[PDB]
Design a binder for these strands. Sequence first.
RNA 1: UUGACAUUAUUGUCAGGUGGGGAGUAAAGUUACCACAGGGAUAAUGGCUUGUGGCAGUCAAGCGUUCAGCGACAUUGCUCGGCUCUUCCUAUCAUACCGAAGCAGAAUUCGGUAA
Lengths: 35, 86, 305, 174
Amino acid sequence: RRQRQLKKFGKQVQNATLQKRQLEKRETLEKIKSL
Amino acid sequence: HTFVRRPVKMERIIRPSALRQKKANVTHPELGVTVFLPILAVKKNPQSPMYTQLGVLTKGTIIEVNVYAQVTNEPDRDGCVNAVLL
Amino acid sequence: YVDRLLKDICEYFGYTPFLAEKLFNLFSPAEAMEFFEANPITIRTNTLKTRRRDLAQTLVNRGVNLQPIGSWTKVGLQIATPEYLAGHYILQAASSFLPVIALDPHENERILDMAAAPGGKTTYISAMMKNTGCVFANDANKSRTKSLIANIHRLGCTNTIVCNYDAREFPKVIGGFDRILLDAPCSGTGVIGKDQSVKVSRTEKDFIQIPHLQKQLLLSAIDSVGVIVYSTCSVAVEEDEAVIDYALRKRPNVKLVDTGLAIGKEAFTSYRGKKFHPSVKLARRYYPHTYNVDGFFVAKFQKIG
Amino acid sequence: MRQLTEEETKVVFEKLAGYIGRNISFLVDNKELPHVFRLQKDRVYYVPDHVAKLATSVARPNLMSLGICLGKFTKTGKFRLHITSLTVLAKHAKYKIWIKPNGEMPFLYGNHVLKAHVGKMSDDIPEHAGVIVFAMNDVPLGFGVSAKSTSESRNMQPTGIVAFRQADIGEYLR
RNA sequence: UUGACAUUAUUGUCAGGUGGGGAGUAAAGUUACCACAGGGAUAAUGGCUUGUGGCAGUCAAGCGUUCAGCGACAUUGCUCGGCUCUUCCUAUCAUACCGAAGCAGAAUUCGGUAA
């Protein structure tokens, strides 16, 4: 009841993680540039 | 390009010493003078916490210099570390 | 007067005149310049595991040149290897030996410490104690506590206790009736030739607060006790020969005792019709240029009451 | 922070049972200077009884170390031994090993012990029994699980591994 | 367990620190080193390629709602080698010609045609 869902969402999980990391990087860069 | 038995918990990610530079080019935005000074420590390397732990010098990294400054250039593509005092 | 000589020191060395003025009280005309001339590498042998004589030849196997340090003790040698990690010796400045020389330990007794963050003094005391009795260690810097425990484990004292709390609260914790150690609380520090930050980063607020804090540290130390030994890595009068005056005035139970050996200088005589000096002339001082050891002060007292 | 439970001492001695046989009983029966075991948030130390008695005056959050640190209990309930314990293990080392003076640096770097170093390691050492290393100085360098018996290690290619390194004095280089 | 108090040495009281041991109103998360195993999809000229850098500032063809931003060229601060016969390219060492250079002659340097 878990491995099938993990396999199905593996691509979605990777995309979400990459998007979150990129958003964090952009937020940090903007905060640095905000000064 | 990065900054440096000291390693403890790192796996086979050996970094050649050629990629290690002790000095960076520091410029003051409010002053028309620039000084070449040693790199003290990396504060926050973006794009990864592991990059901060390993001391990488990617663009945008915040560092400290022996008088905080942020690197603005890409050292991996030119071999120099240009930083602007914050 | 001819202030050009004073200007030369501030010009060449970039020293702030505010701090420089403290080193011109009826001294030699170039005393400040002489002070900056020095502004050595000494290693203390670990007698617990290996004698200095054995280390006087084992290190030579790699071509390392060593010489005895001054005349205080032969335990140290003056100029990453497995010997370093073996605990056979610890890198320690010759100045750091004087607090332990004055603080002569006795076997089976307990030693109380306040700010031995580097851990060299505690390890030397334990070596003199031959791992007997108990040695306390304290430091406000939580991060530096790893240096103390790591050094103790490497040198194998086996009788050291490390705690993190304000030294002023120490008397109410245990208050053991034994000798206590205080070292290097000064703001107007000594070895500045190594601590480059002191050239400019100094203010009157530091001399107002920090000396008035180490002043209470001495009072807390005697309360925690019973030989009392005070020391500071600075030559300024604001760090020694004046702080202990408050402790002597506020507490009669403590009496001044011989600080240490013949090495070192003493207080000055007087200034004509303008200023004088206290009765703390027994205090011993050192300079980074007159002697190999950096600027340092040592004092010893006994609690009669 | 409390005195070690009798059950915990069983596991503590079991871990010590590897590098030290039943002689470990000679580590507390001396009685010349009594010693007790104390723990501080899963970290255990070997401390004299008299010095440990007065240590209770300090609150647990402020005490960082006491006596000589031996090991620490893992979150899963197992026990691991730190390099700091190497100081005491030298007194009762049942099995010992050594490494070449020109090949000790890799050992200090965490590398395993190779057969390239040959000699007269203590006989009767089991295949996986723990061992302790010395240089020219009888100075402990570390401890780890063995990989081959005395006979197997001697009659082996120099490139073969003879002991698995798990702790060494190099931890103090940081 | 530290300090004070009183008794032919010594035993009790007080004060203070500590106190998942006991009395009454311990474990779960965290971790981008997470390491060992489980599993998801990659990774095997779009005319590519070359001689003049990086970060910082003025100088500014013109665009920024009028032009809220950007921005060429010089300028400034430190800074697996090594064998063999043949064919072919020019980004040519020599032979041929020409121009420039304090080219007195000699010799020399660069550039252009030139395989």
